[PDB]
Every structure is written in structure tokens, then in C-alpha cells.
């Protein structure tokens, strides 16, 4: 057998004054699209909700590349209107993969602000303040159970101006409580590019 494609199943809408998740495809259509690799749904926005047959997570467009984590996507293609699209970037050492950004998506601009006051966008459209603590680390201003972050890998960390600062990769927790986050800095994306 052959593994299916990653499938865009929704998005995190950041266009207005309120952030909210939108679903664009149900479970049945997702499984069919994963097998065929043919997705004719219109794509919009910067942060996509994506799914395989077994996992769901996020993917974020930055600089014309739709980025996500290797531990979610593996080496899978992504479904597109013309069929499955092969990864343009794969780096298991960074837990990073990327495809060409879908037609209709909007790309975040890489941050050049040098700010340490960040915001993590989750699959439930929570915008979580995060204080940057290193090249790949930031602390939650309000810790919370890791349950609330599960499924948000591939989502963005944003600066106050809405630039992309990094891609959410892993949670740092003590007794099931997430106190910090580990992320792929945008500079690591820009180098890979
Ligand atoms: C296979 O080839 C590769 C190559 C390179 C890889 N590189 C990494 C770092 C990795 O980590 C795995 C997956 C990741 C995760 O679970 N990611 C988020 C997520 O949501 N995924 S997901 O969408 O639900 C889904 C699984 C569907 C895709 C955001 C997490 C949300 C909640 C945490 C849940 C408990 C888990 C806490 C754990 N914590 C942690 O590992 O901490 C760090 C240690 C780090 C590595 C060392 C450190 F340093 F940060 F402390 C944690 O976060 N993960 C465990 N797998 C790799 C695998
Ligand atoms: Zn910025």
C-alpha cells in the first residue's frame, strides 16, 4: 500500500478582530482526498488545519512555503487540485517539512523586529502570549495542560506586528503542565530556503 496525502481540512481565521477556527472538509471527504491526493477546495489564509489518516495538526504559510512538522507529515505529499504535491523541503533534524504554498493562501512575512513578545496561535484559535527565552524557546505567560497544545504543532509564533517568528514544534511540560514551547525559528526556515 501507499501512504495517503496530507489534507487541508480547515483554517485559523486571523483576518478580523476575532480569531476562530473554520472547518472546510469533513472526515469522510478528508479520507477520500488523502487517498486520491486530489483536493479541489479553495484555500484561504495563513494557518491551515491539516490531517492525515491518523493525525491532525497545523501548517503555516511563510514566504510562499506551507510549513509543518516532520513528526506530523513525515515525507507525505499534500493534496492539491492537480493531485499530490511532493515536499519541497524535508529536514528531520529540524522536525521540519514544507510544500509550495497553495494557490489562494496568504503568506506571513518573516519577522525582522527582534522582539521577544510573541503570540502562539493554536488549532482552537487561542492566541497565547509567549515570552521568547532563546533561539527556539518561549515561556507561556499562563501555563496550561499540554492537552490544550496537542494538535497545534506547525502553528505559528507571531511578533506583535503579525510577522512569523517561528513554527511550533514541541511542548515543555512538568506534570502534564506546559510551561514553555520549543519552536523552529523563522531564520532556520530562511536558511533551509
Ligand atoms: C518522526 O521523526 C521525528 C523527527 C524530529 C522530531 N522532533 C521533536 C521535538 C519530536 O517531539 C515529539 C513530537 C512532539 C509534539 O508532541 N509536538 C506538539 C504537537 O502538538 N504535535 S501533534 O500536532 O499533536 C502530532 C503528534 C500530530 C503531529 C506541539 C506539542 C503539543 C503537546 C505535547 C504533547 C506531549 C509531547 C511532549 C513532547 N515534548 C518534547 O519532546 O520536548 C522536548 C524534549 C523536544 C524534543 C526533546 C523539549 F526539548 F522541547 F523539551 C512534544 O512536544 N513532542 C514529542 N518528534 C520528532 C519526530
Ligand atoms: Zn516582527
Characterize the structure shown.
The chain has about 190 residues and is mainly beta. The protein is about 10% helix and about 40% strand. The chain is built from three helices and 13 strands. The strands form two sheets. It has a seven-stranded antiparallel β-sheet with strand order 2-1-3-4-5-7-6. Strands 8-9-10-13-12-11 form a six-stranded antiparallel beta barrel. The structure holds ligand ZK4 and zinc ion. Ligand ZK4 binds next to helix 2 and strand 12. This is NS3 protease. Keywords: Capsid protein, Glycoprotein, Host membrane, Host-virus interaction, Hydrolase, Membrane, Metal-binding, Protease, Transmembrane, Transmembrane helix, Viral attachment to host cell, Virion, Virus entry into host cell, Zinc. It is found in: Host cell; Host membrane; Virion membrane.
Index terms:
binds zinc ion; 7-stranded antiparallel beta sheet; RNA helicase activity; 193 residues; binds ligand ZK4; Peptidase_S1_PA; 3 helices; 13 strands; mainly beta; Thrombin, subunit H
- The appropriate CATH architecture of the largest domain is Beta Barrel
Question: Largest sheet, described in full?
Answer: 7 strands, antiparallel
Strand portion, in percent?
35-45%
Would you give the CATH topology of the largest domain? Thrombin, subunit H
CA(first)-CA(last) distance? 32 Å
Q: What sequence of helices (H) and strands (E) makes up the elements?
A: EEHEEEHEEEEEEEEH
Count of domains: 2
The side-by-side strand order for the widest beta sheet comes to 2-1-3-4-5-7-6
Q: Which molecules are bound besides the chains?
A: ligand ZK4, zinc ion
Q: How does the overall form come out from the CA principal axes? A: globular
Amino acid at each position: 500500500k501507499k501512504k495517503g496525502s496530507v489534507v487541508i481540512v480547515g483554517r485559523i481565521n486571523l483576518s478580523g478582530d476575532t480569531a476562530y477556527a473554520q472547518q472546510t472538509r469533513g472526515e469522510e471527504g478528508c479520507q477520500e482526498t488523502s487517498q486520491t491526493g486530489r483536493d479541489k477546495n479553495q484555500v484561504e489564509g495563513e494557518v491551515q488545519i491539516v490531517s492525515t489518516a491518523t493525525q491532525t495538526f497545523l501548517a503555516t504559510s511563510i514566504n510562499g512555503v506551507l510549513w509543518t512538522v516532520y513528526h506530523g507529515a513525515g515525507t507525505r505529499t499534500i493534496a492539491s487540485p492537480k493531485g499530490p504535491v511532493t515536499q519541497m523541503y524535508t529536514n528531520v533534524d529540524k522536525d521540519l517539512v514544507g510544500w509550495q504554498a497553495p494557490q489562494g493562501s496568504r503568506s506571513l512575512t518573516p519577522c525582522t523586529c527582534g522582539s521577544s513578545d510573541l503570540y502562539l496561535v493554536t488549532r482552537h484559535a487561542d492566541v497565547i502570549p509567549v515570552r521568547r527565552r532563546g533561539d527556539s524557546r518561549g515561556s507561556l505567560l499562563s501555563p496550561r495542560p499540554i492537552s490544550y497544545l496537542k494538535g497545534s504543532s506547525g502553528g505559528p509564533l507571531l511578533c506583535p506586528a503579525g510577522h512569523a517568528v517561528g513554527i511550533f514544534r514541541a511542548a515543555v511540560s512538568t506534570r502534564g503542565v506546559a510551561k514553555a514551547v520549543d519552536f523552529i525559528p523563522v531564520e532556520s526556515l530562511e536558511t533551509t530556503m
